[PDB]
Structure formats: C-alpha cells, structure tokens
Predict the structure.
Amino acid sequence: MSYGRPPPDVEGMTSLKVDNLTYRTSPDTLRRVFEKYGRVGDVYIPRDRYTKESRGFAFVRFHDKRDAEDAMDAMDGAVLDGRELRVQMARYGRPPDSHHS
RNA sequence: UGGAGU
C-alpha cells in the first residue's frame, strides 16, 4: 500500500509546508509529529525520485488554517542542534515534470 | 531545496 496519487484540495485550503528534517528523521515521524496539531493532507519527500541523496527535508502539507498556524507557532524554530524545524505557508504548487525529458 | 506521486 502506497500514496500513488493522493488527490488534495490545495485550491481551497491553507496548504501549509514543513521542512528541516534532521539527519535522523523521516516522513512517517513528520506525520505522527505534525498530525497531533490537527490534520495533514500530505506528507511526502521528493527524494530525487531515484537518488535520495538529498532527504534534508520532507514537504508536509496541511489544510486547516488554525492547525497550520498553530503547528508553525508551536514547533518552527524549536531547534537545538542547528536544524530541527522550518514550517510556513506554501506559495508553490505540484511539479508538472522534473524527473523526465 | 519549498513536493520527482501513478
């Protein structure tokens, strides 16, 4: 079982974004950790789709404004080693293509 | 480096 192609509603929701995954974090943790604030519409990683050498972040996505600004006002900048969280609103949309030619 | 999904 996998995401495949989860259809969001980004055209009518807050579409929050989160990043700054530590050298020991994963999207499954980023989900259980940000799900407690309310809900998450997606939690996914570009992982260069075939090289995964980046993984320095995991683009999580929210829909509730009140739960998106709260998770941001309650976890971003809560760092203690040089990088723990970075969360703010998205202003950029899904890729049409970045992995083929 | 703010997303490369069948």
